[PDB]
């Protein structure tokens, strides 16, 4: 917090209260909360030979595997989740036309990192209840008017 | 010349007509050799955004 030298003194008294993160950013419980859609990189034509090696280096270090089927290297997608989409397949001129970089729309990969106040499985459960609470409040006012 | 920053090491023992300081200054992520000659990265004036 501070850093001192002899003769110097700090004495204070803090008052912690409850608040939401829309008010001030010291109330937010998450380091970052975000999502990404899931990749499905698909090979339109079979990539064999020494083009299989340069296709495995145009991606993240664990998604394309090169396997030997007859003493010959063929490439297949193995774990497309680990891809960050640096779009290095478009710098190469021969291999732009064999891939279809895409994203599955209805498949999200949430990443919730908490700051330590309460663990992140409880954070998502609390967050879902808040949206349930927002819908509950306006149902009460449609009942109050009508 | 107008950027807020840090006047020097004596800046807290210094009483001036008007002094501006930035609370959490950072040194430039991209820098000239001239920045190293004048020692600007010892008392920098700005933040990486």
């Amino acid at each position: 917090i501070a850093q001192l030298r002899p003769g110097q003194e700090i004495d204070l008294l803090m008052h912690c209260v409850k608040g939401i993160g829309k008010d001030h950013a010291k109330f937010s419980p998450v380091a970052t909360a975000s999502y990404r859609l899931l990749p499905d990189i698909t090979l339109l034509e079979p990539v064999e030979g020494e083009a299989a090696e340069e296709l495995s280096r145009c991606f993240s270090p664990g998604v394309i595997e090169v396997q030997e089927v007859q003493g010959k290297k063929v490439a297949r997608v193995a774990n497309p989740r680990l891809d960050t989409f640096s779009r290095e397949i478009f710098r190469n001129e021969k291999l732009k036309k064999v891939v279809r970089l895409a994203r599955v729309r209805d498949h999200y990969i949430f990443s919730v990192e908490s700051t330590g106040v309460l663990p992140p499985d409880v954070l998502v459960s609390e967050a879902i209840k808040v949206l349930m609470g927002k819908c509950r409040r306006f149902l009460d006012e449609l009942d109050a008017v009508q | 010349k107008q950027a807020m920053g840090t006047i020097g090491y004596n800046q807290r023992n210094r009483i001036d007509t008007l002094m501006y300081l930035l609370a959490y200054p950072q040194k430039p992520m991209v820098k000239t050799k001239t920045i190293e000659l004048i020692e600007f990265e010892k008392l920098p004036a700005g933040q990486n955004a």
Binding site: - | A23, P25, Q26
Partner: protein, 66 residues
């Protein structure tokens, strides 16, 4: 002056990494190995330690004392 408690861009607590970061640089890690060992994946957290100037360690000489 002194290391900020939270990263401006995301709010990860980088304010406790500073006394570790200087220690690892005595064991002759590089900067890019030292930040990876503390858990700073995103570059917005990395610039907190990489661009910081420890001014309070030098203002506190001039500061009055007994």
């Amino acid at each position: 002056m002194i290391i900020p408690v939270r990263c401006f861009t995301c709010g990860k607590i980088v304010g406790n990494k500073w006394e570790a970061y200087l220690g690892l640089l005595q064991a002759e890690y590089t900067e890019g190995d030292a930040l990876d060992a503390l858990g700073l994946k995103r570059y917005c957290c990395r610039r907190m330690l990489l661009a910081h100037v420890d001014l309070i360690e030098k203002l506190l000489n001039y500061a009055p004392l007994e």
